[PDB]
Amino acid sequence: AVSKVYARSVYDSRGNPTVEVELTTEKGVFRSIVPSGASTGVHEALEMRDGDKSKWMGKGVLHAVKNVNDVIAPAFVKANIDVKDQKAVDDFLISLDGTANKSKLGANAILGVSLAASRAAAAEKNVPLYKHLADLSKSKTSPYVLPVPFLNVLNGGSHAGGALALQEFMIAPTGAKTFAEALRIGSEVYHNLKSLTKKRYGASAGNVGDEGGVAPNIQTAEEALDLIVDAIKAAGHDGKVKIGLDCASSEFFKDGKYDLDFKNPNSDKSKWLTGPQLADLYHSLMKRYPIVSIEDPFAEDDWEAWSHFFKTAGIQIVADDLTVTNPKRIATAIEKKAADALLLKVNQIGTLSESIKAAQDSFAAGWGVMVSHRSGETEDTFIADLVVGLRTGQIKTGAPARSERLAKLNQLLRIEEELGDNAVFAGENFHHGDKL
Amino acid sequence: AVSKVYARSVYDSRGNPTVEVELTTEKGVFRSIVPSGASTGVHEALEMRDGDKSKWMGKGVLHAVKNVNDVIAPAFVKANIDVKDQKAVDDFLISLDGTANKSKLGANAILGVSLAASRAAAAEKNVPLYKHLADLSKSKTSPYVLPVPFLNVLNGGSHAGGALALQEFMIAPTGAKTFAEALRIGSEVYHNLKSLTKKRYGASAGNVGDEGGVAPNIQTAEEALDLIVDAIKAAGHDGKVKIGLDCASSEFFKDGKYDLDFKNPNSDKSKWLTGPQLADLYHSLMKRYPIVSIEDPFAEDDWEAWSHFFKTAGIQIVADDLTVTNPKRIATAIEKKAADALLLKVNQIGTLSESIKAAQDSFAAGWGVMVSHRSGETEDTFIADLVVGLRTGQIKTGAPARSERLAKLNQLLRIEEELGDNAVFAGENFHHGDKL
Ligand SMILES: *O[C](*)C(*)(*)(*)(O(*)(*)P(*)(*)(*)(*)(O*)(O*)=O*)C(*)(*)(*)(O*)=O*
Ligand SMILES: *O[C](*)C(*)(*)(*)(O(*)(*)P(*)(*)(*)(*)(O*)(O*)=O*)C(*)(*)(*)(O*)=O*
Ligand SMILES: [Mg+2]
Ligand SMILES: [Mg+2]
Ligand SMILES: [Mg+2]
Ligand SMILES: [Mg+2]
């Protein structure tokens, strides 16, 4: 039984406060921490901020913390809920807020309670978190599937100062035989990239963005891609490493057009692209580089653009801001054949139950699912256990630099070790890892 | 009783492998992870690397890990050691290696077990880590002293690409009334700094170095310091925030002189300074800025330069590479009056026991002690509990950006909360926190 529910303010990877929750049971104290995005889709569940410009630059979470402590806590403990019953847990929480967007208590007040209960339940059951998550999701566990890590080695958009519009340039070692191998390979590529980047664009170019990737000040995707393929080759991994993109196009969508100079306050409107024009740009990239996944190619409500591009795209198309880990939205995307992959962010929806449903619905439609961190991460490692539980075969949790990234990557090495032969590595089967 | 000793490879904050150790007892599994420096002193205990250029660029730790699993492990379990007896743990470890610089086993193999044992001990005693650390160290806990966090908000030297020679530019909110306040103020200064830096030196200048500080490509310390001052004022914390420096001068000491353009392969030898000329620069900075602490002003063996400068310094002078957390070297520095504070790094010496001895010897000499992370950190939080346990009153564990940094800072917030009125904040008494 839950004897205490408590929250506190802690700091994220960027130096902004976030919510940390602890749940106490007869099994101990279970702690979960809420992540925070930067390029947040307009449809995400509410992240409650204090908005007091005089403290934390207006980003405190005292209100959210207070909602946990003064609203949720006593009520939750009184309720005497069965932590093992995730659904019951989330039902209680959702009910307590009573809003569609969790704007009453805030998504960042709900989430940590949701996640912490799951940790508690795993403890009650005496099983590892990933196994409990496979249980809650009714996922197959024989064998378990370890994900290919999509490492964001070169950062742009809203994640790094510089002119580069596209947000993320990831490498995925789909050719590795094990997760450990993939991580080694990814780290080697990363070091080579850092060195080539300083050489080609200047010492400052090697300094990092929010997600740990290098941050050269360049105007085009080709300049980033060229560096990456060069790094793969220098590292000796040609053919084992593929590329993924996160366009985060909503960040540059204005006036029905797409601004690839969006970070320039005086950007030339005459240069903004139409949806078709942008699609042609992407096709150029696809034909040239070993890109196997493109995320958020069009804006979060630009349905027609997505559907149109989708019929011509011969690779994984990931929905992020389009879907916001929301089953309702996913259903729209599925019917419209807008994408074939969901980017899963527990904090975009606010509860673990909802997130799991999002995953299930996606898998039911033949889509893939890439579990993801936020640009504002913490020392929390939930998502590592989550992507294994969910059997997705793919995760994005950063470059192999900045510990809020490595913490998940390290957790995955521990999981692998623990499972041994009871797990396979998704490798080239990443898209449908759940069906392995 | 310890039933198992095990080690595995994990990744540090820069993407390099490091050693992670787990000790299993009646109480559970206790994990400790080893950090890795960049600007490592020539006299530091040996960090064992594999040197297989085909794997991790030669940076693997498989040998060290194998040392723990195949050499330390069996002997250690067989010995049936009392984890609560830290000296016995350490003597055992030291003796097993039998080398002056822990080059047989590797200091990175030894340290993980040393630390993991202390965590095991604390659990056996049913006390929080920091309390056990206070016990091991014969420290006073009534009250405990929370440290002033020295935040490395602007990075240079070997920690960030760019021209800037001195390594670190730290802010220290000695005017805060609580640790939580100090951290808030610090973060706010940091945000103001990032924005000012992008404006003054360009967008890329806001990207970060290894320790999470902003990384402007500037030639001089005054340029860095002006930014900091400007940020402090902008944040509204004028008078509550002081400055600390880490010169890491050994990194630019060549042919008996100091190269302030050491990262330029075509640096002007005619511009390299002598010890006295360097001291002149320091005095000028100290006059101009609210600097309360200077670390590694002169090279690791340039005794006379230290000795001379110290005569008229008048602020805290921290020894890092000069002492390498080594009591023998500390004895010298005390004898020559070279400095008045020790930078404490468990991995410079290799055992918790020798590190506690170093601290004790320092405090006994009237010196201060600043507990420190390495530039290559992990999600491990040991140092947070250590600084509190040793009651030093001061720690440096990065900018309030990059979770390998926030993890510690968050842990101190937790400790502070736990302690409540049983603890005081060092504030302006940071130098002699132990005597508070
Ligand atoms: O890379 C994670 C996420 O960025 P946020 O967290 O929204 O700034 C993305 O868009 O995939
Ligand atoms: O900032 C910590 C340390 O840097 P390393 O770890 O040696 O690269 C220093 O010199 O104080
Ligand atoms: Mg986003
Ligand atoms: Mg995205
Ligand atoms: Mg150093
Ligand atoms: Mg130093």
mmCIF file of N, CA and C in Angstrom, chain B residues 109-186:
data_model
loop_
_atom_site.group_PDB
_atom_site.id
_atom_site.type_symbol
_atom_site.label_atom_id
_atom_site.label_comp_id
_atom_site.label_asym_id
_atom_site.label_seq_id
_atom_site.Cartn_x
_atom_site.Cartn_y
_atom_site.Cartn_z
ATOM 1 N N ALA B 109 39.971 0.461 -11.539
ATOM 2 C CA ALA B 109 39.446 -0.821 -11.101
ATOM 3 C C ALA B 109 39.290 -0.727 -9.609
ATOM 4 N N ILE B 110 40.332 -0.212 -8.958
ATOM 5 C CA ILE B 110 40.257 -0.090 -7.523
ATOM 6 C C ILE B 110 39.159 0.822 -6.971
ATOM 7 N N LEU B 111 39.072 2.007 -7.507
ATOM 8 C CA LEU B 111 38.142 2.997 -6.971
ATOM 9 C C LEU B 111 36.684 2.517 -6.905
ATOM 10 N N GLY B 112 36.202 1.896 -7.998
ATOM 11 C CA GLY B 112 34.793 1.421 -7.998
ATOM 12 C C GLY B 112 34.489 0.504 -6.815
ATOM 13 N N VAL B 113 35.390 -0.428 -6.509
ATOM 14 C CA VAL B 113 35.141 -1.278 -5.390
ATOM 15 C C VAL B 113 35.178 -0.481 -4.101
ATOM 16 N N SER B 114 36.155 0.445 -3.985
ATOM 17 C CA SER B 114 36.291 1.248 -2.795
ATOM 18 C C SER B 114 35.010 1.996 -2.500
ATOM 19 N N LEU B 115 34.499 2.697 -3.515
ATOM 20 C CA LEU B 115 33.278 3.437 -3.309
ATOM 21 C C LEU B 115 32.071 2.506 -3.074
ATOM 22 N N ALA B 116 31.962 1.467 -3.874
ATOM 23 C CA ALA B 116 30.788 0.558 -3.739
ATOM 24 C C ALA B 116 30.713 -0.042 -2.345
ATOM 25 N N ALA B 117 31.878 -0.317 -1.748
ATOM 26 C CA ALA B 117 31.936 -0.799 -0.393
ATOM 27 C C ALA B 117 31.350 0.209 0.602
ATOM 28 N N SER B 118 31.621 1.458 0.392
ATOM 29 C CA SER B 118 31.106 2.439 1.326
ATOM 30 C C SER B 118 29.577 2.539 1.216
ATOM 31 N N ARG B 119 29.054 2.305 0.015
ATOM 32 C CA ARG B 119 27.604 2.373 -0.141
ATOM 33 C C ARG B 119 26.960 1.172 0.549
ATOM 34 N N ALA B 120 27.630 0.045 0.406
ATOM 35 C CA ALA B 120 27.173 -1.185 1.041
ATOM 36 C C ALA B 120 27.131 -1.035 2.555
ATOM 37 N N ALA B 121 28.176 -0.376 3.087
ATOM 38 C CA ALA B 121 28.326 -0.140 4.490
ATOM 39 C C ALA B 121 27.237 0.754 5.059
ATOM 40 N N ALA B 122 26.935 1.806 4.331
ATOM 41 C CA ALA B 122 25.921 2.719 4.747
ATOM 42 C C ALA B 122 24.555 1.977 4.868
ATOM 43 N N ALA B 123 24.288 1.118 3.882
ATOM 44 C CA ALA B 123 23.032 0.314 3.862
ATOM 45 C C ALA B 123 23.034 -0.658 5.054
ATOM 46 N N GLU B 124 24.166 -1.292 5.302
ATOM 47 C CA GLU B 124 24.278 -2.190 6.433
ATOM 48 C C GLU B 124 23.971 -1.459 7.731
ATOM 49 N N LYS B 125 24.411 -0.221 7.776
ATOM 50 C CA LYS B 125 24.214 0.599 8.969
ATOM 51 C C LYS B 125 22.876 1.272 8.970
ATOM 52 N N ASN B 126 22.175 1.166 7.874
ATOM 53 C CA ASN B 126 20.906 1.809 7.775
ATOM 54 C C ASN B 126 21.049 3.292 7.992
ATOM 55 N N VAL B 127 22.003 3.865 7.271
ATOM 56 C CA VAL B 127 22.159 5.324 7.356
ATOM 57 C C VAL B 127 22.345 5.828 5.943
ATOM 58 N N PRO B 128 22.084 7.122 5.719
ATOM 59 C CA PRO B 128 22.302 7.729 4.408
ATOM 60 C C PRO B 128 23.796 7.774 4.128
ATOM 61 N N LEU B 129 24.208 7.709 2.849
ATOM 62 C CA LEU B 129 25.651 7.730 2.512
ATOM 63 C C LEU B 129 26.422 8.868 3.245
ATOM 64 N N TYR B 130 25.937 10.081 3.099
ATOM 65 C CA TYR B 130 26.650 11.216 3.704
ATOM 66 C C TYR B 130 26.874 11.040 5.195
ATOM 67 N N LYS B 131 25.984 10.327 5.892
ATOM 68 C CA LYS B 131 26.194 10.146 7.290
ATOM 69 C C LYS B 131 27.293 9.141 7.517
ATOM 70 N N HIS B 132 27.297 8.091 6.725
ATOM 71 C CA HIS B 132 28.375 7.145 6.883
ATOM 72 C C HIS B 132 29.692 7.782 6.556
ATOM 73 N N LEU B 133 29.680 8.634 5.531
ATOM 74 C CA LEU B 133 30.943 9.335 5.145
ATOM 75 C C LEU B 133 31.442 10.239 6.277
ATOM 76 N N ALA B 134 30.523 10.895 6.965
ATOM 77 C CA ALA B 134 30.878 11.714 8.085
ATOM 78 C C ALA B 134 31.459 10.832 9.154
ATOM 79 N N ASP B 135 30.825 9.690 9.379
ATOM 80 C CA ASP B 135 31.399 8.778 10.382
ATOM 81 C C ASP B 135 32.838 8.327 10.022
ATOM 82 N N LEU B 136 33.063 7.904 8.756
ATOM 83 C CA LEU B 136 34.358 7.405 8.350
ATOM 84 C C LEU B 136 35.429 8.450 8.522
ATOM 85 N N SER B 137 35.016 9.687 8.410
ATOM 86 C CA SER B 137 35.888 10.816 8.442
ATOM 87 C C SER B 137 35.953 11.541 9.754
ATOM 88 N N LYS B 138 35.231 11.065 10.742
ATOM 89 C CA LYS B 138 35.214 11.708 12.051
ATOM 90 C C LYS B 138 34.762 13.133 11.980
ATOM 91 N N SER B 139 33.782 13.357 11.126
ATOM 92 C CA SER B 139 33.282 14.692 10.954
ATOM 93 C C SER B 139 32.105 15.005 11.866
ATOM 94 N N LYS B 140 31.935 16.275 12.166
ATOM 95 C CA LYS B 140 30.842 16.758 12.981
ATOM 96 C C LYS B 140 29.525 16.798 12.160
ATOM 97 N N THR B 141 28.397 16.419 12.755
ATOM 98 C CA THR B 141 27.148 16.452 11.972
ATOM 99 C C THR B 141 26.075 17.243 12.695
ATOM 100 N N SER B 142 26.469 18.084 13.613
ATOM 101 C CA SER B 142 25.482 18.834 14.338
ATOM 102 C C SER B 142 25.964 20.257 14.513
ATOM 103 N N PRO B 143 25.785 21.040 13.464
ATOM 104 C CA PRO B 143 25.109 20.547 12.290
ATOM 105 C C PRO B 143 26.036 20.232 11.148
ATOM 106 N N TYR B 144 25.394 19.676 10.137
ATOM 107 C CA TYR B 144 26.010 19.388 8.904
ATOM 108 C C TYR B 144 26.155 20.759 8.240
ATOM 109 N N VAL B 145 27.070 20.816 7.277
ATOM 110 C CA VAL B 145 27.332 22.019 6.463
ATOM 111 C C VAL B 145 27.085 21.703 4.983
ATOM 112 N N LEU B 146 26.236 22.513 4.353
ATOM 113 C CA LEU B 146 25.951 22.318 2.932
ATOM 114 C C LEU B 146 26.952 23.181 2.189
ATOM 115 N N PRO B 147 27.489 22.700 1.061
ATOM 116 C CA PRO B 147 28.486 23.503 0.347
ATOM 117 C C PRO B 147 27.958 24.601 -0.564
ATOM 118 N N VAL B 148 28.828 25.587 -0.808
ATOM 119 C CA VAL B 148 28.586 26.601 -1.817
ATOM 120 C C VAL B 148 28.948 25.852 -3.122
ATOM 121 N N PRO B 149 28.047 25.858 -4.116
ATOM 122 C CA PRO B 149 28.349 25.195 -5.345
ATOM 123 C C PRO B 149 29.154 26.195 -6.257
ATOM 124 N N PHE B 150 30.321 25.766 -6.734
ATOM 125 C CA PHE B 150 31.105 26.614 -7.622
ATOM 126 C C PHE B 150 30.741 26.161 -9.029
ATOM 127 N N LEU B 151 29.903 26.967 -9.698
ATOM 128 C CA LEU B 151 29.405 26.573 -11.026
ATOM 129 C C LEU B 151 30.193 27.045 -12.223
ATOM 130 N N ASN B 152 30.813 26.100 -12.908
ATOM 131 C CA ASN B 152 31.615 26.352 -14.127
ATOM 132 C C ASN B 152 30.765 26.642 -15.346
ATOM 133 N N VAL B 153 30.252 27.890 -15.353
ATOM 134 C CA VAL B 153 29.314 28.421 -16.335
ATOM 135 C C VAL B 153 29.912 28.845 -17.673
ATOM 136 N N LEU B 154 31.242 29.008 -17.734
ATOM 137 C CA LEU B 154 31.924 29.383 -18.968
ATOM 138 C C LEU B 154 33.140 28.477 -19.121
ATOM 139 N N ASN B 155 33.192 27.625 -20.176
ATOM 140 C CA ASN B 155 34.287 26.684 -20.268
ATOM 141 C C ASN B 155 35.361 27.021 -21.294
ATOM 142 N N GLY B 156 36.641 26.614 -21.016
ATOM 143 C CA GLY B 156 37.706 26.883 -21.968
ATOM 144 C C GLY B 156 38.740 25.799 -21.897
ATOM 145 N N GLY B 157 39.989 26.162 -22.136
ATOM 146 C CA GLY B 157 41.073 25.201 -22.007
ATOM 147 C C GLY B 157 40.779 23.872 -22.745
ATOM 148 N N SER B 158 41.115 22.735 -22.083
ATOM 149 C CA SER B 158 40.973 21.435 -22.644
ATOM 150 C C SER B 158 39.524 20.936 -22.638
ATOM 151 N N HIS B 159 38.605 21.773 -22.112
ATOM 152 C CA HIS B 159 37.185 21.399 -21.960
ATOM 153 C C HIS B 159 36.281 21.902 -23.040
ATOM 154 N N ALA B 160 36.775 22.791 -23.862
ATOM 155 C CA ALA B 160 35.906 23.356 -24.919
ATOM 156 C C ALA B 160 36.721 23.830 -26.106
ATOM 157 N N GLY B 161 36.226 23.609 -27.346
ATOM 158 C CA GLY B 161 36.901 24.061 -28.548
ATOM 159 C C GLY B 161 36.820 25.549 -28.583
ATOM 160 N N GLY B 162 37.937 26.169 -28.937
ATOM 161 C CA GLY B 162 37.996 27.635 -28.964
ATOM 162 C C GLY B 162 39.407 28.149 -28.473
ATOM 163 N N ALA B 163 39.632 29.453 -28.609
ATOM 164 C CA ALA B 163 40.951 29.992 -28.237
ATOM 165 C C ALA B 163 41.273 30.126 -26.722
ATOM 166 N N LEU B 164 40.216 30.293 -25.905
ATOM 167 C CA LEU B 164 40.354 30.541 -24.479
ATOM 168 C C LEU B 164 41.231 29.556 -23.771
ATOM 169 N N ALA B 165 42.328 30.071 -23.120
ATOM 170 C CA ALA B 165 43.256 29.192 -22.425
ATOM 171 C C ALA B 165 42.836 28.717 -21.037
ATOM 172 N N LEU B 166 42.495 29.657 -20.126
ATOM 173 C CA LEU B 166 42.136 29.208 -18.795
ATOM 174 C C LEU B 166 40.929 28.239 -18.945
ATOM 175 N N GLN B 167 40.903 27.239 -18.108
ATOM 176 C CA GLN B 167 39.908 26.190 -18.188
ATOM 177 C C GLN B 167 38.504 26.480 -17.703
ATOM 178 N N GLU B 168 38.389 27.083 -16.574
ATOM 179 C CA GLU B 168 37.087 27.247 -15.969
ATOM 180 C C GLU B 168 36.884 28.578 -15.341
ATOM 181 N N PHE B 169 35.657 29.045 -15.522
ATOM 182 C CA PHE B 169 35.120 30.302 -14.995
ATOM 183 C C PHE B 169 33.839 29.975 -14.246
ATOM 184 N N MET B 170 33.980 29.880 -12.907
ATOM 185 C CA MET B 170 32.926 29.508 -11.965
ATOM 186 C C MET B 170 32.269 30.646 -11.234
ATOM 187 N N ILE B 171 30.951 30.467 -10.949
ATOM 188 C CA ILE B 171 30.229 31.446 -10.141
ATOM 189 C C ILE B 171 29.968 30.700 -8.864
ATOM 190 N N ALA B 172 29.966 31.436 -7.743
ATOM 191 C CA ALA B 172 29.779 30.855 -6.436
ATOM 192 C C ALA B 172 28.850 31.773 -5.680
ATOM 193 N N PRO B 173 27.617 31.321 -5.445
ATOM 194 C CA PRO B 173 26.610 32.192 -4.766
ATOM 195 C C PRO B 173 26.760 32.127 -3.237
ATOM 196 N N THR B 174 27.851 32.754 -2.762
ATOM 197 C CA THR B 174 28.199 32.738 -1.344
ATOM 198 C C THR B 174 27.250 33.578 -0.556
ATOM 199 N N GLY B 175 26.529 34.473 -1.265
ATOM 200 C CA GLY B 175 25.554 35.377 -0.620
ATOM 201 C C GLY B 175 24.155 34.744 -0.480
ATOM 202 N N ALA B 176 23.966 33.510 -0.976
ATOM 203 C CA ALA B 176 22.671 32.831 -0.859
ATOM 204 C C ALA B 176 22.472 32.408 0.571
ATOM 205 N N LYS B 177 21.228 32.169 1.007
ATOM 206 C CA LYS B 177 21.040 31.771 2.395
ATOM 207 C C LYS B 177 20.846 30.252 2.616
ATOM 208 N N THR B 178 20.651 29.536 1.525
ATOM 209 C CA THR B 178 20.440 28.120 1.521
ATOM 210 C C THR B 178 21.009 27.567 0.215
ATOM 211 N N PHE B 179 21.301 26.275 0.236
ATOM 212 C CA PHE B 179 21.804 25.598 -0.922
ATOM 213 C C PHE B 179 20.797 25.728 -2.051
ATOM 214 N N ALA B 180 19.520 25.480 -1.760
ATOM 215 C CA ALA B 180 18.519 25.597 -2.791
ATOM 216 C C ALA B 180 18.511 26.980 -3.416
ATOM 217 N N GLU B 181 18.762 28.019 -2.575
ATOM 218 C CA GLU B 181 18.766 29.365 -3.112
ATOM 219 C C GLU B 181 19.967 29.592 -4.043
ATOM 220 N N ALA B 182 21.122 29.073 -3.567
ATOM 221 C CA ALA B 182 22.351 29.188 -4.321
ATOM 222 C C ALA B 182 22.174 28.571 -5.689
ATOM 223 N N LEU B 183 21.542 27.378 -5.744
ATOM 224 C CA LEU B 183 21.334 26.717 -7.021
ATOM 225 C C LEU B 183 20.389 27.490 -7.974
ATOM 226 N N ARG B 184 19.308 28.031 -7.400
ATOM 227 C CA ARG B 184 18.416 28.830 -8.200
ATOM 228 C C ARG B 184 19.162 30.038 -8.793
ATOM 229 N N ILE B 185 19.816 30.783 -7.877
ATOM 230 C CA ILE B 185 20.536 31.986 -8.334
ATOM 231 C C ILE B 185 21.513 31.609 -9.447
ATOM 232 N N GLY B 186 22.246 30.537 -9.181
ATOM 233 C CA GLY B 186 23.231 30.052 -10.150
ATOM 234 C C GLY B 186 22.600 29.755 -11.504
#
